[PDB]
Amino acid sequence: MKYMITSKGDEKSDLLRLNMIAGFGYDMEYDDVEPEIVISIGGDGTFLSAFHQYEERLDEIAFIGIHTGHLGFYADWRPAEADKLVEYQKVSYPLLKTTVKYGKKEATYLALNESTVKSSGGPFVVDVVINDIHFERFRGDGLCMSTPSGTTAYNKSLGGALMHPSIEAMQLTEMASINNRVYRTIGSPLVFPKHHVVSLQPVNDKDFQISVDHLSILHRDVQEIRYEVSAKKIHFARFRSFPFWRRVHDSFIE
Amino acid sequence: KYMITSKGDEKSDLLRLNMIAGFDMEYDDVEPEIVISIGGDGTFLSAFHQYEERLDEIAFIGIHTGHLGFYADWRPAEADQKVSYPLLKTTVKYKEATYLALNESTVKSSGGPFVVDVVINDIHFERFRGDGLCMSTPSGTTAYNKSLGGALMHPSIEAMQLTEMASINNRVYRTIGSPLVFPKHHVVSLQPVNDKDFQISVDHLSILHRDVQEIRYEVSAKKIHFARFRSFPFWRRVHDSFIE
Amino acid sequence: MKYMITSKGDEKSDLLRLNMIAGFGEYDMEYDDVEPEIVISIGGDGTFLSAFHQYEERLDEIAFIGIHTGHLGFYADWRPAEADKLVKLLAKGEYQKVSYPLLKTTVKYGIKKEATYLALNESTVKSSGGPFVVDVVINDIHFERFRGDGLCMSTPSGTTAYNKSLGGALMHPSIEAMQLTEMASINNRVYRTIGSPLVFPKHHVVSLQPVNDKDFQISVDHLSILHRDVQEIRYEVSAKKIHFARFRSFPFWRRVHDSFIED
Amino acid sequence: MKYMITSKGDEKSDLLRLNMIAGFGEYDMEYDDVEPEIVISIGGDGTFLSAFHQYEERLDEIAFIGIHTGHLGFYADWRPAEADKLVKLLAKGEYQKVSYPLLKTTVKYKEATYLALNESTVKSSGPFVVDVVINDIHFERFRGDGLCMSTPSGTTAYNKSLGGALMHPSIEAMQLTEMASINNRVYRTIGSPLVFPKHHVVSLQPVNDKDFQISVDHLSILHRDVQEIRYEVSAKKIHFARFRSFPFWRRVHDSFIEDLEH
Ligand SMILES: [N-]=[N+]=NC[C@H]1O[C@@H](n2c(SCC(=O)NCCc3c[nH]c4ccccc34)nc3c(N)ncnc32)[C@H](O)[C@@H]1O
Ligand SMILES: [N-]=[N+]=NC[C@H]1O[C@@H](n2c(SCC(=O)NCCc3c[nH]c4ccccc34)nc3c(N)ncnc32)[C@H](O)[C@@H]1O
Ligand SMILES: [N-]=[N+]=NC[C@H]1O[C@@H](n2c(SCC(=O)NCCc3c[nH]c4ccccc34)nc3c(N)ncnc32)[C@H](O)[C@@H]1O
Ligand SMILES: [N-]=[N+]=NC[C@H]1O[C@@H](n2c(SCC(=O)NCCc3c[nH]c4ccccc34)nc3c(N)ncnc32)[C@H](O)[C@@H]1O
């Protein structure tokens, strides 16, 4: 079938890539337009690029991650096992939908790890609105809405909770909240189920640094930033049994 | 067919009498379909553990005589569909003993250090050393779980959350630090290392267990049913409690 | 004696400034922004920080005074309505001086020369884009290899600021120390960090040494500039201290209570 | 000079203890367990804490030494394989002395005072609710499991597990950390750990219940009808015997980070 392979850039990834492509020279044809199997070689950062490269056809693509360096949560296959990889089950992980409104039109984005909103320099002040209901007035560095699979990324470093990627939900964590009598925040991470909409509304400044995984751009004149669990899912190709918690253990505990 | 529990104070007992007077409703504490709690969340917990054997045929209603609770959302000046929340199944192994929790289930030592092996799905995850561990229900996240640094999750999510209690987290006993949220059919097994005497607590019930071989945690198939008359959002209840 | 007054910029602060200057004009007070002995900041903590760095070359000859036109600050503890009593007490010289410790930041390059900075609140170091990875060396001894957003070294008085939002502890400004806090540490198998904030005494040096990237985004009291080809970043408690003019007694813990709990 | 040795209890501690006593049998060392000048602890930090309270009324005439039979401790810095060197070094009388600050715990109901090397915690006997007073000034009303006041050297103990900051023992201060605070509309607490210098008094005053489970280090007691719990940096200090540079941060490193040569 149709497939394609992306590379990190280093010699180890490109050499391993060419080594695998020649292996398919079976009934496998290389195609980067309409692939059925996308293979990422490098790390989680490399895998994220492959996700956004083919986010228009997530329903017809199974992803496979290979790490040339340290173990990743997406790139979970060693280069020494590249021979065996060249008949599988499909595992689906939830994604995050980020919608931005302006003063025009609106923009939507898909996240595999998380989406963060920070200030354009000074203090980040927004009103956190949960399901058309005011919850808190936040003041700090920013806010982080994480995917289940993305909880082991930025979310964890921010003191968030680790969620199993079988749970369809999203998690909101604080970034250096001042948390005083004027700007009282919840402090605890908040996990939202499906059909729940978290709305971030400006108070004074209208310019925000919205980031989606590995892409941070400046959005001017922002009226609203809404978060909710996307209906679209990312599909993986399961060959062996590598449990999520086991993958967490090998990463942080060892 | 229904029944009514009371906290113990005069305000709760007298209000209870008024509700009986209001009720083709036959008062039956044997096989009730409607259980009404009067007092607070603590009183509500007592009503839950009173009928664990018939949680599938009972809809609960909470009335707070004191401050607002997460389970008692009805003011006493209002005595005049079903919503299901997940539960936590706690199994202690020696003949095994099982317990159901509405808020959470914590395991501490019987005096000295608390040292166990955290096993996730028959696979060792970490060796814990500290005060103890806390496995919380979705609805119980706004309780002890929050104080321990745990995350707040909406009760519509069927899962369980494990949080640390003063982990030493060093070379020998490296822990994850972050709270862990486990879905359905996931089993967290806590296995002793040396001392096998632990102070296992289920919600408001803290009992001492001797000769413990294994403590297993998993989301129970049984769910607690509430009676929804109005619409009080979970996040609004969190807002009114911690954000004033 | 010689004095000067800085203003936030709004009408209220500027108005208060002119009236105080006229107030001092009734006594033996000379206005001088070049070599003053008393620097009065009118506005907020941010305004106070600007006045600090404006005269960081003569901190030994200056007693600072903060006046908050808005909400109460940790550096600006005087209300505008007390400006009249402030002038009269300043003119007589009826006040004692209280000293707060400062943080010394030293940046080394691939010999550029060598840059030094003084911080009243804190000094932070982050990357210039990607992952921030450095080796934390405490007193010429390797302590940890850090990977994350960055690191924040705070002064005692600066603990109630960015430090607190990062989970740092609150120290009384009488304690001569500095506090290092983590900024979103990945803290895994490869990059194991302490997690806990670290309080260092005087004469202790925390050296941050690069692993791959030499470019770092260093900020001193929100003066964030890009430093290229960085060889070393050293942290130590400065021998220089900031001097305040004390007329009454506003306890640090009360200022903490009035700011984060209730007022 | 006069010395004594405490033991954990196991075979390793008792055997190593006998070897040292016999080791001092070639030098001018008098063994005395009632009025010693050098107290040696064999076992762990728990053993050291026991040796501290055993001779806490003569802290001015005693320099302590710790030997860890198991993992590295913050008070037991010496290895069992270095016991041979310790005897000769102690006999030669060649060592500088290092002093660590202590925590003074006062319980009023007559007045009871306690000295802590690590920390002093106060819990309930149900909900623990007290009013935290800092220098005769109300700061917050706490509600949770309890409160922990830690010594500088004690910051690496329970204080670290509670999320407190690590302080160098050269700093004469004390640190207050929360224990499972509820922090809501009614009971708003600071959250952050608080570090107090000398001459600063932290007063814990009851709200409803007067009974509290007050613990000082290993000693966990129960005080009834408590009116006030006072915390302040004690004037008394514990003295150590230094032979070689073993930095505090190294002990922190070798305990929480990694120990590659072990
Ligand atoms: N604005 N201003 N003045 C700079 C002061 O801001 C304090 N400081 C900072 S400065 C670092 C920064 O760029 N943060 C992005 C958001 C932000 C900038 N300035 C803030 C001031 C208050 C609150 C948020 C910000 N962040 C924080 C922080 N999250 N919570 C508390 N306090 C901070 C820090 O003490 C610094 O000295
Ligand atoms: N009782 N007692 N033990 C004395 C030392 O134990 C230290 N201490 C304590 S005492 C409070 C307590 O009952 N903890 C329950 C579990 C436990 C007891 N002792 C431990 C020692 C190490 C680890 C866990 C325990 N907890 C802790 C704590 N989580 N992490 C570190 N160290 C602690 C505390 O500093 C005290 O100095
Ligand atoms: N036992 N009991 N009561 C039942 C509920 O009390 C809730 N729960 C507890 S019970 C554990 C305990 O023994 N804590 C000592 C102090 C305490 C006891 N009950 C409390 C209730 C509120 C606040 C403090 C206590 N602690 C906590 C906690 N620190 N912050 C929040 N909520 C808690 C917990 O959810 C439990 O299910
Ligand atoms: N790897 N990679 N690509 C970007 C991903 O990196 C993850 N991500 C980030 S991105 C936010 C950021 O700019 N942080 C500054 C330093 C940094 C950039 N990328 C990093 C990757 C690992 C560690 C630090 C950085 N920070 C973090 C974080 N502290 N700990 C864990 N993971 C993070 C985040 O999930 C993002 O999706």
mmCIF file with all atom_site columns, all heavy atoms in Angstrom, chain B residues 131 144 147 167-168 170-171 174 241, chain D residues 145 158 160-161 181 185 254-257, unseen atoms left out:
data_model
loop_
_atom_site.group_PDB
_atom_site.id
_atom_site.type_symbol
_atom_site.label_atom_id
_atom_site.label_alt_id
_atom_site.label_comp_id
_atom_site.label_asym_id
_atom_site.label_entity_id
_atom_site.label_seq_id
_atom_site.pdbx_PDB_ins_code
_atom_site.Cartn_x
_atom_site.Cartn_y
_atom_site.Cartn_z
_atom_site.occupancy
_atom_site.B_iso_or_equiv
_atom_site.pdbx_formal_charge
_atom_site.auth_seq_id
_atom_site.auth_comp_id
_atom_site.auth_asym_id
_atom_site.auth_atom_id
_atom_site.pdbx_PDB_model_num
ATOM 1   N N   . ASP B 1 131 ? 3.930   9.029  53.320 1.00 0.00 ? 131 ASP B N   1
ATOM 2   C CA  . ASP B 1 131 ? 2.814   8.939  54.254 1.00 0.00 ? 131 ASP B CA  1
ATOM 3   C C   . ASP B 1 131 ? 1.771   7.942  53.770 1.00 0.00 ? 131 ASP B C   1
ATOM 4   O O   . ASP B 1 131 ? 1.201   7.195  54.563 1.00 0.00 ? 131 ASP B O   1
ATOM 5   C CB  . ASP B 1 131 ? 2.170   10.312 54.461 1.00 0.00 ? 131 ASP B CB  1
ATOM 6   C CG  . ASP B 1 131 ? 3.060   11.262 55.237 1.00 0.00 ? 131 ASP B CG  1
ATOM 7   O OD1 . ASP B 1 131 ? 4.273   10.988 55.349 1.00 0.00 ? 131 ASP B OD1 1
ATOM 8   O OD2 . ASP B 1 131 ? 2.547   12.287 55.733 1.00 0.00 ? 131 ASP B OD2 1
ATOM 9   N N   . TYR B 1 144 ? -10.409 15.482 49.467 1.00 0.00 ? 144 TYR B N   1
ATOM 10  C CA  . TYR B 1 144 ? -9.040  15.239 49.919 1.00 0.00 ? 144 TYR B CA  1
ATOM 11  C C   . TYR B 1 144 ? -8.055  15.284 48.755 1.00 0.00 ? 144 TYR B C   1
ATOM 12  O O   . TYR B 1 144 ? -6.930  15.768 48.895 1.00 0.00 ? 144 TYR B O   1
ATOM 13  C CB  . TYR B 1 144 ? -8.947  13.886 50.627 1.00 0.00 ? 144 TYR B CB  1
ATOM 14  C CG  . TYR B 1 144 ? -7.746  13.720 51.533 1.00 0.00 ? 144 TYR B CG  1
ATOM 15  C CD1 . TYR B 1 144 ? -6.924  14.795 51.843 1.00 0.00 ? 144 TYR B CD1 1
ATOM 16  C CD2 . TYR B 1 144 ? -7.432  12.481 52.075 1.00 0.00 ? 144 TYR B CD2 1
ATOM 17  C CE1 . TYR B 1 144 ? -5.827  14.641 52.672 1.00 0.00 ? 144 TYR B CE1 1
ATOM 18  C CE2 . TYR B 1 144 ? -6.338  12.317 52.902 1.00 0.00 ? 144 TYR B CE2 1
ATOM 19  C CZ  . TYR B 1 144 ? -5.539  13.398 53.198 1.00 0.00 ? 144 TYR B CZ  1
ATOM 20  O OH  . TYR B 1 144 ? -4.450  13.235 54.023 1.00 0.00 ? 144 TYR B OH  1
ATOM 21  N N   . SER B 1 147 ? -6.656  18.694 48.031 1.00 0.00 ? 147 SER B N   1
ATOM 22  C CA  . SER B 1 147 ? -5.717  19.123 49.061 1.00 0.00 ? 147 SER B CA  1
ATOM 23  C C   . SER B 1 147 ? -4.349  18.471 48.880 1.00 0.00 ? 147 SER B C   1
ATOM 24  O O   . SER B 1 147 ? -3.327  19.027 49.283 1.00 0.00 ? 147 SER B O   1
ATOM 25  C CB  . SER B 1 147 ? -6.267  18.802 50.452 1.00 0.00 ? 147 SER B CB  1
ATOM 26  O OG  . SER B 1 147 ? -7.467  19.512 50.700 1.00 0.00 ? 147 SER B OG  1
ATOM 27  N N   . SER B 1 167 ? 5.517   11.959 49.428 1.00 0.00 ? 167 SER B N   1
ATOM 28  C CA  . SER B 1 167 ? 6.500   11.011 48.918 1.00 0.00 ? 167 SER B CA  1
ATOM 29  C C   . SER B 1 167 ? 7.917   11.529 49.132 1.00 0.00 ? 167 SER B C   1
ATOM 30  O O   . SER B 1 167 ? 8.192   12.708 48.905 1.00 0.00 ? 167 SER B O   1
ATOM 31  C CB  . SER B 1 167 ? 6.266   10.743 47.431 1.00 0.00 ? 167 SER B CB  1
ATOM 32  O OG  . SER B 1 167 ? 7.233   9.840  46.915 1.00 0.00 ? 167 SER B OG  1
ATOM 33  N N   . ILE B 1 168 ? 8.815   10.651 49.568 1.00 0.00 ? 168 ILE B N   1
ATOM 34  C CA  . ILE B 1 168 ? 10.207  11.033 49.758 1.00 0.00 ? 168 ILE B CA  1
ATOM 35  C C   . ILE B 1 168 ? 10.868  11.267 48.395 1.00 0.00 ? 168 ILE B C   1
ATOM 36  O O   . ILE B 1 168 ? 11.722  12.145 48.254 1.00 0.00 ? 168 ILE B O   1
ATOM 37  C CB  . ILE B 1 168 ? 10.994  9.966  50.572 1.00 0.00 ? 168 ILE B CB  1
ATOM 38  C CG1 . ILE B 1 168 ? 12.397  10.475 50.919 1.00 0.00 ? 168 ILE B CG1 1
ATOM 39  C CG2 . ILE B 1 168 ? 11.063  8.634  49.836 1.00 0.00 ? 168 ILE B CG2 1
ATOM 40  C CD1 . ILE B 1 168 ? 12.396  11.718 51.782 1.00 0.00 ? 168 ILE B CD1 1
ATOM 41  N N   . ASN B 1 170 ? 13.173  9.711  46.131 1.00 0.00 ? 170 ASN B N   1
ATOM 42  C CA  . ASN B 1 170 ? 14.625  9.773  46.016 1.00 0.00 ? 170 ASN B CA  1
ATOM 43  C C   . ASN B 1 170 ? 15.173  8.719  45.055 1.00 0.00 ? 170 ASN B C   1
ATOM 44  O O   . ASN B 1 170 ? 14.437  8.184  44.226 1.00 0.00 ? 170 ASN B O   1
ATOM 45  C CB  . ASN B 1 170 ? 15.276  9.627  47.396 1.00 0.00 ? 170 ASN B CB  1
ATOM 46  C CG  . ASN B 1 170 ? 14.844  8.366  48.126 1.00 0.00 ? 170 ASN B CG  1
ATOM 47  O OD1 . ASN B 1 170 ? 14.334  7.420  47.523 1.00 0.00 ? 170 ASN B OD1 1
ATOM 48  N ND2 . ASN B 1 170 ? 15.052  8.348  49.437 1.00 0.00 ? 170 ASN B ND2 1
ATOM 49  N N   . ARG B 1 171 ? 16.465  8.427  45.172 1.00 0.00 ? 171 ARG B N   1
ATOM 50  C CA  . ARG B 1 171 ? 17.110  7.433  44.319 1.00 0.00 ? 171 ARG B CA  1
ATOM 51  C C   . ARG B 1 171 ? 16.480  6.056  44.484 1.00 0.00 ? 171 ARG B C   1
ATOM 52  O O   . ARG B 1 171 ? 16.150  5.390  43.502 1.00 0.00 ? 171 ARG B O   1
ATOM 53  C CB  . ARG B 1 171 ? 18.604  7.340  44.628 1.00 0.00 ? 171 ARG B CB  1
ATOM 54  C CG  . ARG B 1 171 ? 19.349  8.652  44.550 1.00 0.00 ? 171 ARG B CG  1
ATOM 55  C CD  . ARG B 1 171 ? 20.845  8.439  44.718 1.00 0.00 ? 171 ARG B CD  1
ATOM 56  N NE  . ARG B 1 171 ? 21.182  7.716  45.941 1.00 0.00 ? 171 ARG B NE  1
ATOM 57  C CZ  . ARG B 1 171 ? 21.600  6.454  45.972 1.00 0.00 ? 171 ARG B CZ  1
ATOM 58  N NH1 . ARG B 1 171 ? 21.736  5.772  44.843 1.00 0.00 ? 171 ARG B NH1 1
ATOM 59  N NH2 . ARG B 1 171 ? 21.884  5.876  47.130 1.00 0.00 ? 171 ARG B NH2 1
ATOM 60  N N   . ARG B 1 174 ? 11.982  6.186  43.754 1.00 0.00 ? 174 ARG B N   1
ATOM 61  C CA  . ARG B 1 174 ? 11.620  7.162  42.734 1.00 0.00 ? 174 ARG B CA  1
ATOM 62  C C   . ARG B 1 174 ? 10.143  7.058  42.375 1.00 0.00 ? 174 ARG B C   1
ATOM 63  O O   . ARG B 1 174 ? 9.678   6.017  41.913 1.00 0.00 ? 174 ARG B O   1
ATOM 64  C CB  . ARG B 1 174 ? 12.476  6.972  41.480 1.00 0.00 ? 174 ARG B CB  1
ATOM 65  C CG  . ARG B 1 174 ? 12.284  8.056  40.433 1.00 0.00 ? 174 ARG B CG  1
ATOM 66  C CD  . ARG B 1 174 ? 12.834  9.388  40.915 1.00 0.00 ? 174 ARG B CD  1
ATOM 67  N NE  . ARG B 1 174 ? 14.291  9.366  41.017 1.00 0.00 ? 174 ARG B NE  1
ATOM 68  C CZ  . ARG B 1 174 ? 15.014  10.301 41.624 1.00 0.00 ? 174 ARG B CZ  1
ATOM 69  N NH1 . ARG B 1 174 ? 14.416  11.338 42.198 1.00 0.00 ? 174 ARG B NH1 1
ATOM 70  N NH2 . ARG B 1 174 ? 16.334  10.198 41.663 1.00 0.00 ? 174 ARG B NH2 1
ATOM 71  N N   . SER B 1 241 ? -17.171 27.256 45.754 1.00 0.00 ? 241 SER B N   1
ATOM 72  C CA  . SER B 1 241 ? -16.479 26.708 46.914 1.00 0.00 ? 241 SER B CA  1
ATOM 73  C C   . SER B 1 241 ? -15.085 27.298 47.111 1.00 0.00 ? 241 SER B C   1
ATOM 74  O O   . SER B 1 241 ? -14.723 27.692 48.218 1.00 0.00 ? 241 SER B O   1
ATOM 75  C CB  . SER B 1 241 ? -16.380 25.185 46.796 1.00 0.00 ? 241 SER B CB  1
ATOM 76  O OG  . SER B 1 241 ? -15.669 24.635 47.891 1.00 0.00 ? 241 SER B OG  1
ATOM 77  N N   . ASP D 2 145 ? -4.729  18.733 57.193 1.00 0.00 ? 145 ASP D N   1
ATOM 78  C CA  . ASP D 2 145 ? -4.141  17.663 57.988 1.00 0.00 ? 145 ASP D CA  1
ATOM 79  C C   . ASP D 2 145 ? -3.307  18.224 59.134 1.00 0.00 ? 145 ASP D C   1
ATOM 80  O O   . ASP D 2 145 ? -3.394  17.746 60.264 1.00 0.00 ? 145 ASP D O   1
ATOM 81  C CB  . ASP D 2 145 ? -3.288  16.745 57.112 1.00 0.00 ? 145 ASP D CB  1
ATOM 82  C CG  . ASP D 2 145 ? -4.124  15.866 56.204 1.00 0.00 ? 145 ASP D CG  1
ATOM 83  O OD1 . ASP D 2 145 ? -5.275  16.245 55.903 1.00 0.00 ? 145 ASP D OD1 1
ATOM 84  O OD2 . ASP D 2 145 ? -3.631  14.793 55.792 1.00 0.00 ? 145 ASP D OD2 1
ATOM 85  N N   . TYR D 2 158 ? 10.982  15.536 56.192 1.00 0.00 ? 158 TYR D N   1
ATOM 86  C CA  . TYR D 2 158 ? 9.545   15.620 55.950 1.00 0.00 ? 158 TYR D CA  1
ATOM 87  C C   . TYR D 2 158 ? 9.192   16.866 55.137 1.00 0.00 ? 158 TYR D C   1
ATOM 88  O O   . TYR D 2 158 ? 8.299   16.833 54.288 1.00 0.00 ? 158 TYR D O   1
ATOM 89  C CB  . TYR D 2 158 ? 8.786   15.624 57.280 1.00 0.00 ? 158 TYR D CB  1
ATOM 90  C CG  . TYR D 2 158 ? 7.338   15.192 57.189 1.00 0.00 ? 158 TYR D CG  1
ATOM 91  C CD1 . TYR D 2 158 ? 6.793   14.750 55.988 1.00 0.00 ? 158 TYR D CD1 1
ATOM 92  C CD2 . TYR D 2 158 ? 6.517   15.229 58.308 1.00 0.00 ? 158 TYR D CD2 1
ATOM 93  C CE1 . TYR D 2 158 ? 5.471   14.354 55.909 1.00 0.00 ? 158 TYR D CE1 1
ATOM 94  C CE2 . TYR D 2 158 ? 5.194   14.836 58.239 1.00 0.00 ? 158 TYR D CE2 1
ATOM 95  C CZ  . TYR D 2 158 ? 4.676   14.400 57.037 1.00 0.00 ? 158 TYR D CZ  1
ATOM 96  O OH  . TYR D 2 158 ? 3.359   14.009 56.965 1.00 0.00 ? 158 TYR D OH  1
ATOM 97  N N   . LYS D 2 160 ? 10.730  18.279 52.734 1.00 0.00 ? 160 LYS D N   1
ATOM 98  C CA  . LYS D 2 160 ? 10.927  18.073 51.304 1.00 0.00 ? 160 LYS D CA  1
ATOM 99  C C   . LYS D 2 160 ? 9.749   17.313 50.701 1.00 0.00 ? 160 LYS D C   1
ATOM 100 O O   . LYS D 2 160 ? 9.278   17.644 49.612 1.00 0.00 ? 160 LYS D O   1
ATOM 101 C CB  . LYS D 2 160 ? 12.239  17.323 51.048 1.00 0.00 ? 160 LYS D CB  1
ATOM 102 C CG  . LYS D 2 160 ? 12.659  17.252 49.584 1.00 0.00 ? 160 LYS D CG  1
ATOM 103 C CD  . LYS D 2 160 ? 12.211  15.956 48.924 1.00 0.00 ? 160 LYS D CD  1
ATOM 104 C CE  . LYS D 2 160 ? 12.626  15.906 47.463 1.00 0.00 ? 160 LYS D CE  1
ATOM 105 N NZ  . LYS D 2 160 ? 12.178  14.646 46.807 1.00 0.00 ? 160 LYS D NZ  1
ATOM 106 N N   . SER D 2 161 ? 9.278   16.295 51.416 1.00 0.00 ? 161 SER D N   1
ATOM 107 C CA  . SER D 2 161 ? 8.160   15.477 50.954 1.00 0.00 ? 161 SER D CA  1
ATOM 108 C C   . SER D 2 161 ? 6.855   16.267 50.915 1.00 0.00 ? 161 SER D C   1
ATOM 109 O O   . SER D 2 161 ? 5.953   15.951 50.139 1.00 0.00 ? 161 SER D O   1
ATOM 110 C CB  . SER D 2 161 ? 7.995   14.245 51.847 1.00 0.00 ? 161 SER D CB  1
ATOM 111 O OG  . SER D 2 161 ? 9.141   13.415 51.786 1.00 0.00 ? 161 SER D OG  1
ATOM 112 N N   . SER D 2 181 ? -3.791  21.314 52.823 1.00 0.00 ? 181 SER D N   1
ATOM 113 C CA  . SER D 2 181 ? -4.695  22.425 53.095 1.00 0.00 ? 181 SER D CA  1
ATOM 114 C C   . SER D 2 181 ? -5.884  22.400 52.141 1.00 0.00 ? 181 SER D C   1
ATOM 115 O O   . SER D 2 181 ? -5.737  22.067 50.965 1.00 0.00 ? 181 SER D O   1
ATOM 116 C CB  . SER D 2 181 ? -3.955  23.760 52.981 1.00 0.00 ? 181 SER D CB  1
ATOM 117 O OG  . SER D 2 181 ? -4.830  24.852 53.205 1.00 0.00 ? 181 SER D OG  1
ATOM 118 N N   . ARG D 2 185 ? -13.091 29.199 50.139 1.00 0.00 ? 185 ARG D N   1
ATOM 119 C CA  . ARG D 2 185 ? -13.631 30.523 50.420 1.00 0.00 ? 185 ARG D CA  1
ATOM 120 C C   . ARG D 2 185 ? -13.503 30.879 51.899 1.00 0.00 ? 185 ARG D C   1
ATOM 121 O O   . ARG D 2 185 ? -13.194 32.019 52.248 1.00 0.00 ? 185 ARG D O   1
ATOM 122 C CB  . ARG D 2 185 ? -15.098 30.603 49.990 1.00 0.00 ? 185 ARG D CB  1
ATOM 123 N N   . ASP D 2 254 ? 23.430  13.340 46.396 1.00 0.00 ? 254 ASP D N   1
ATOM 124 C CA  . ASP D 2 254 ? 23.616  11.895 46.511 1.00 0.00 ? 254 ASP D CA  1
ATOM 125 C C   . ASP D 2 254 ? 22.384  11.170 47.046 1.00 0.00 ? 254 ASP D C   1
ATOM 126 O O   . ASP D 2 254 ? 22.337  9.942  47.045 1.00 0.00 ? 254 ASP D O   1
ATOM 127 C CB  . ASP D 2 254 ? 24.816  11.590 47.412 1.00 0.00 ? 254 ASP D CB  1
ATOM 128 C CG  . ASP D 2 254 ? 26.118  12.118 46.848 1.00 0.00 ? 254 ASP D CG  1
ATOM 129 O OD1 . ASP D 2 254 ? 26.234  12.218 45.608 1.00 0.00 ? 254 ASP D OD1 1
ATOM 130 O OD2 . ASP D 2 254 ? 27.028  12.433 47.643 1.00 0.00 ? 254 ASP D OD2 1
ATOM 131 N N   . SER D 2 255 ? 21.390  11.925 47.504 1.00 0.00 ? 255 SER D N   1
ATOM 132 C CA  . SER D 2 255 ? 20.198  11.322 48.088 1.00 0.00 ? 255 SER D CA  1
ATOM 133 C C   . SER D 2 255 ? 18.998  11.359 47.148 1.00 0.00 ? 255 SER D C   1
ATOM 134 O O   . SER D 2 255 ? 18.275  10.373 47.024 1.00 0.00 ? 255 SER D O   1
ATOM 135 C CB  . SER D 2 255 ? 19.841  12.018 49.404 1.00 0.00 ? 255 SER D CB  1
ATOM 136 O OG  . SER D 2 255 ? 18.676  11.452 49.979 1.00 0.00 ? 255 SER D OG  1
ATOM 137 N N   . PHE D 2 256 ? 18.786  12.493 46.486 1.00 0.00 ? 256 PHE D N   1
ATOM 138 C CA  . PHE D 2 256 ? 17.602  12.669 45.650 1.00 0.00 ? 256 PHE D CA  1
ATOM 139 C C   . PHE D 2 256 ? 17.903  12.567 44.157 1.00 0.00 ? 256 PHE D C   1
ATOM 140 O O   . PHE D 2 256 ? 17.061  12.113 43.381 1.00 0.00 ? 256 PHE D O   1
ATOM 141 C CB  . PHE D 2 256 ? 16.938  14.015 45.951 1.00 0.00 ? 256 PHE D CB  1
ATOM 142 C CG  . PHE D 2 256 ? 16.445  14.145 47.363 1.00 0.00 ? 256 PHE D CG  1
ATOM 143 C CD1 . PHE D 2 256 ? 17.106  14.956 48.272 1.00 0.00 ? 256 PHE D CD1 1
ATOM 144 C CD2 . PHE D 2 256 ? 15.318  13.461 47.782 1.00 0.00 ? 256 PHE D CD2 1
ATOM 145 C CE1 . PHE D 2 256 ? 16.652  15.077 49.572 1.00 0.00 ? 256 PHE D CE1 1
ATOM 146 C CE2 . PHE D 2 256 ? 14.860  13.576 49.082 1.00 0.00 ? 256 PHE D CE2 1
ATOM 147 C CZ  . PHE D 2 256 ? 15.527  14.386 49.977 1.00 0.00 ? 256 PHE D CZ  1
ATOM 148 N N   . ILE D 2 257 ? 19.097  12.991 43.752 1.00 0.00 ? 257 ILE D N   1
ATOM 149 C CA  . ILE D 2 257 ? 19.460  12.977 42.338 1.00 0.00 ? 257 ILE D CA  1
ATOM 150 C C   . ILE D 2 257 ? 20.027  11.622 41.925 1.00 0.00 ? 257 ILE D C   1
ATOM 151 O O   . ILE D 2 257 ? 19.309  10.784 41.379 1.00 0.00 ? 257 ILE D O   1
ATOM 152 C CB  . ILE D 2 257 ? 20.481  14.080 42.004 1.00 0.00 ? 257 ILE D CB  1
ATOM 153 C CG1 . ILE D 2 257 ? 19.997  15.429 42.537 1.00 0.00 ? 257 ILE D CG1 1
ATOM 154 C CG2 . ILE D 2 257 ? 20.713  14.155 40.501 1.00 0.00 ? 257 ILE D CG2 1
ATOM 155 C CD1 . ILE D 2 257 ? 18.678  15.881 41.948 1.00 0.00 ? 257 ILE D CD1 1
#
